[PDB]
Write a protein that binds this ligand. Structure first.
Ligand SMILES: Nc1ncnc2c1ncn2[C@@H]1O[C@H](COP(=O)(O)OP(=O)(O)OP(=O)(O)O)[C@@H](O)[C@H]1O
Ligand SMILES: Nc1ncnc2c1ncn2[C@@H]1O[C@H](COP(=O)(O)OP(=O)(O)OP(=O)(O)O)[C@@H](O)[C@H]1O
Ligand SMILES: [Mg+2]
Ligand SMILES: [Mg+2]
Lengths: 269, 270
């Protein structure tokens, strides 16, 4: 479901901040059914990024999976082209991780990875490239009910603005999420890209929400890939092996999400 | 509502302009190749306020299928621009075709076209779908009449374009007599009855060898025509004068249904 949602049917509320060329607001849609939704308002300055920001969310709308956020449609809401998608109560994971680095143990982290890998495998099967996998773009639907054992639940946000059109300056600032082959030529974006980013994303999860290579600058980030280094194993290096397998400078050596799911399940609960 | 990547769109010839649109013959690119001939309508950023209407004009035009409706492959929220991708009908608009071969077309040729048109309108009426801009221009000729092969012409109805519910009154008044009197005094009166009126006027074009009714009248003399409650003169052929008037009934509730319009057209043996 990807419809041309009208500005008349959208009510904006509180702003959740801004992002990569977007202003984020909580709102409501009127279809009569009123439904809470997330509104990513593409700034008018960067309005030329719409041909990929929304076309990607569109293809993700055609597919169905319990771990893919629902992208409802688009609005030519005035001077801005806006994305209307499902709202997630607890927001991005990268923040939730840092806010609860201690309480979050190994079992909690493992279930999240399984849920993510499931969505990535789904995308791989459907051959849909995300291009922006990261603990930021992972949204927490449900917390862990320890006393009841209820597992957490996550949903993968929309693909976003393609890295095939973003400026090279921000691509280098996005290392180690943007894989090497894409830094070399952005037109190398392929399914293998998300495997690398999955490794970087897994590092975030194991690191209690920390950010890989936050201290380095773009030039030093460029050298890390030049020297073909690898991310360090977090303080809880139970998954360190799988990270490096995904962050493999040879794209064809990065394991399929089918095999990755097996590894994750092999780690027991 | 399918979104296409701009790179896949290859502009070529320019087919003039439409209602706040620049028309281009182009190609779609899409695994080996995938070169599809298409029609490109570009909505300027100066006219971004007509986005919802310009898009919705083709959105619902595609949610259903019919052999006499043009197929819209997709659109682009291309940022600065907004583009519509639809099938390219070879021979172009019917109004022009009728004039280019005015002294060479017969009634059976014209009547066959009317039935095809009514068929499309009937399909739309059943689905509670309003076109809003029925005219010989928005009618595109797929195939010519092959006398030797004894096969008929074929046509399709293009999208409505930007809805008259948002166009300026100056445009509406100039679109008379295609805009029904009830919409000239309130565009929000647009309903299924609007198309029956517009259909009758479109038939008048067909019978007139491609000419356009009320051409030598300004928008002010056109307004008096509706105020005086006049009717369009009978065509030189004079076969469908009644059906036109029946369709162009100043009372919307009395305008016939396309179900019945098809019977009368089928009833016209000639
Ligand atoms: N679907 C959503 N539901 C709830 N909160 C969301 C949703 N999408 C984004 N957010 C919130 O947006 C903030 C982060 O936005 P973010 O930077 O990911 O936006 P963006 O423009 O999509 O970025 P990018 O395309 O670079 O990933 C966080 O508060 C996150 O909780
Ligand atoms: N689908 C099509 N296939 C082939 N030619 C087309 C098609 N649509 C338009 N054209 C050509 O474009 C010319 C002008 O187009 P037209 O005026 O119908 O555009 P428009 O933007 O749809 O306008 P309007 O909103 O006023 O109906 C037509 O005479 C015809 O030559
Ligand atoms: Mg995001
Ligand atoms: Mg048209």
């Amino acid at each position: 479901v990807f419809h041309l949602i009208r500005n008349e049917d959208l009510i904006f509320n509180e702003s959740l901040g801004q992002g990569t060329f977007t202003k984020i607001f909580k709102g409501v849609r009127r279809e009569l059914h009123e439904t809470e939704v997330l509104l990513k308002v593409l700034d008018k300055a960067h309005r030329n990024y719409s041909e990929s920001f929304f076309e990607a969310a569109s293809m993700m709308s055609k597919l169905s999976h319990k771990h893919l956020v629902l992208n409802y449609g688009v609005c030519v809401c005035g001077d801005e082209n806006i994305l209307v998608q499902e709202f997630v109560k607890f927001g991005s994971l990268d923040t939730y991780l840092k806010k609860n680095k201690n309480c979050i143990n190994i079992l909690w982290k493992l279930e999240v990875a399984k849920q993510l890998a499931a969505a990535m495998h789904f995308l791989e099967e459907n051959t849909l490239i995300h291009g922006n996998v990261c603990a930021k773009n992972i949204l927490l639907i449900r917390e862990e009910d320890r006393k009841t054992g209820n597992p957490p639940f996550i949903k993968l946000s929309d693909p976003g603005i393609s890295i095939t059109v973003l400026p090279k300056d921000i691509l280098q600032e996005r290392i180690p999420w943007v894989p090497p082959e894409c830094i070399e030529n952005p037109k190398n974006l392929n399914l293998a890209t998300d495997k690398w980013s999955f490794g970087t994303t897994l590092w975030e999860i194991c690191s209690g929400g920390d950010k890989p290579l936050s201290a380095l600058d773009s030039q030093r980030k460029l050298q890390f890939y030049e020297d073909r280094h690898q991310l360090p194993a977090p303080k809880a290096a139970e998954l360190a092996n799988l990270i490096n397998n995904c962050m493999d400078y040879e794209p064809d050596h990065r394991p399929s999400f089918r095999a990755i799911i097996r590894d994750l399940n092999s780690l027991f609960t």
